[PDB]
Design a protein around this ligand. Structure first.
Ligand SMILES: *[C@@H]1O[C@H](CO[C@@H]2O[C@@H](C)[C@@H](O)[C@@H](O)[C@@H]2O)[C@@H](O[C@@H]2O[C@H](CO)[C@@H](O)[C@H](O)[C@H]2NC(C)=O)[C@H](O)[C@H]1NC(C)=O
Length: 77
């Protein structure tokens, strides 16, 4: 999956790059402050496998399966 991967927790990442290996679900987390951007698994995209790996909790991780679907446009209802 090709998604944007930033070196820091910014709220406007625009660097498109292929996702590392062992990654089939793009992840777009938003802890009301920083829009995390990283390649995540579809099995680890639950309400415990992400808030634990990042060592956080209050956040809305949204996994996707489209070349670049973790952008900042899928968490504003
Ligand atoms: C992500 O990687 C792809 C590499 O795709 C390869 O080429 C495809 C045509 C297909 O054969 C895949 O199975 C291959 O793995 C990048 O796409 C190519 O990248 C090369 C080198 O950068 C470039 O010369 C080609 O023209 C590109 N072709 C296409 C269709 O993209 C792609 O750009 C990478 N994306 C990012 C954000 O890095």
């Amino acid at each position: 999956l090709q998604c944007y991967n930033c070196p820091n927790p910014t709220a406007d990442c625009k660097t498109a790059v292929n996702c590392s290996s062992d990654f089939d679900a793009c992840l777009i987390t938003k802890a009301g402050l920083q829009v995390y951007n990283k390649c995540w698994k579809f099995e680890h995209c639950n309400f415990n496998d992400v808030t634990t790996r990042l060592r956080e909790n209050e956040l809305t991780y949204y996994c996707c399966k489209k070349d670049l679907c973790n952008f900042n446009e899928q968490l504003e209802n």
